[PDB]
Paper text:
The structure in space group [name] has an asymmetric unit comprising two MK-[name] trimers (6 protein chains). Clear electron density is evident for only one vertex of the macrocycle that complexes Lys1 in one protein chain. The cocrystals grown in PEG (low salt) include only one STP3 per 6 protein monomers and the protein–macrocycle interfaces are partly disordered.
We report two cocrystal structures of a mutant [name] lectin ([name]) in complex with the recently described sulfated terphen ­arene (STP3). [name] lectin ([name]) is a case in point with four polymorphs identified to date. ,, [name] is a neutral trimer with a toroidal, β-propeller fold. Sulfated terphen­ ­arene (STP3) is a large, rigid, triangular macrocycle comprising terphenyl sides, methylene vertices, and 12 sulfate substituents. , Owing to the sulfates, STP3 has high water solubility and a low propensity to self-associate (as evidenced by 1H NMR in D2O). We then turned to the mutant MK-[name], which contains a Met-Lys motif at the N-terminus of [name].
Residue numbers in the entry:
A (entry chain A), B (entry chain C), C (entry chain B): 0 to 90
Amino acid sequence: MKSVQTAATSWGTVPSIRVYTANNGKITERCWDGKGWYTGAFNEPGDNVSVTSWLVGSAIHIRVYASTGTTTTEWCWDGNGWTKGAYTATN
Amino acid sequence: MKSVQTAATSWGTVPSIRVYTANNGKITERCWDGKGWYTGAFNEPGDNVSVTSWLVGSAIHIRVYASTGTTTTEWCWDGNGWTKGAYTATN
Amino acid sequence: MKSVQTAATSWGTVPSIRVYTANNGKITERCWDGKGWYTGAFNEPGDNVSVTSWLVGSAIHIRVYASTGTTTTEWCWDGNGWTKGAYTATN
Ligand SMILES: OC[C@@]1(O)OC[C@@H](O)[C@@H](O)[C@@H]1O
Ligand SMILES: OC[C@@]1(O)OC[C@@H](O)[C@@H](O)[C@@H]1O
Ligand SMILES: OC[C@@]1(O)OC[C@@H](O)[C@@H](O)[C@@H]1O
Ligand SMILES: OC[C@@]1(O)OC[C@@H](O)[C@@H](O)[C@@H]1O
Ligand SMILES: OC[C@@]1(O)OC[C@@H](O)[C@@H](O)[C@@H]1O
Ligand SMILES: OC[C@@]1(O)OC[C@@H](O)[C@@H](O)[C@@H]1O
């Protein structure tokens, strides 16, 4: 019995938390902004996940690294929707 | 599981570091505060681990996400003990 | 199928990002500082990887925890080359 795999990030002092879970090839996102957990907009394929985030002033930026096989895809949140990032592995 | 699985967080400029290792279904904690590595109070079940933390002043707040199977348990350090948090993977 | 396993850290407001990938027993590093992804100096054996980093002023310090079997090795970046750290899982 394998286990799901998670990645977590947080920012500010409320704080906001985002937890990403890779489960059966699908990565989903749960969100905390101080008043209960809810399901976020991130939904992308992957068996492995890592995450980092940074603030510019008050604006959060999130990068999620989703891996299937040997291919890692980066996904970007910059305040107005998830988009694919430029990340590639060694060529 | 071939190898153990780790997660790490750090805070301040000394820094303090906490490293969580999932090994044989148990997660344990090693701590650095600038003066040598020692074993921390965290000990909970899990095959997978992730962590995030934030400061309020000089006071650290840690959240560890411990997963076994498809069950992810959030553990909260807010200065005095590890308490089960409100996190669920789905409302 | 099995997939590679990653860990990510970031700092500053550009930001700089480092992504560590464990692939078939080797951990390598990809780097972003605003101007394209490139291959970093980090290269160490391991089947699992986690990372944390902290700034002291504008100087970044990175700790990478590489695991093979039950043995976790800490690798330290402090501005001038990767060195093995004092981390042990026991004692
Ligand atoms: O406010 C919720 C939300 O917009 O926060 C930023 C990202 O985590 C999004 O996926 C998420 O749906
Ligand atoms: O704004 C998108 C982006 O430029 O952000 C920094 C890195 O995450 C890049 O790979 C990514 O394409
Ligand atoms: O000083 C050690 C300690 O109290 O630091 C905060 C948490 O990491 C605890 O598990 C840990 O025992
Ligand atoms: O104080 C505990 C708590 O409220 O902290 C913020 C989140 O980690 C919650 O899931 C958790 O229950
Ligand atoms: O500029 C790239 C670099 O020096 O940045 C700090 C560390 O990530 C190093 O491994 C890496 O080669
Ligand atoms: O400067 C290296 C070092 O002292 O930094 C703090 C911890 O990462 C230690 O394990 C490590 O040896």
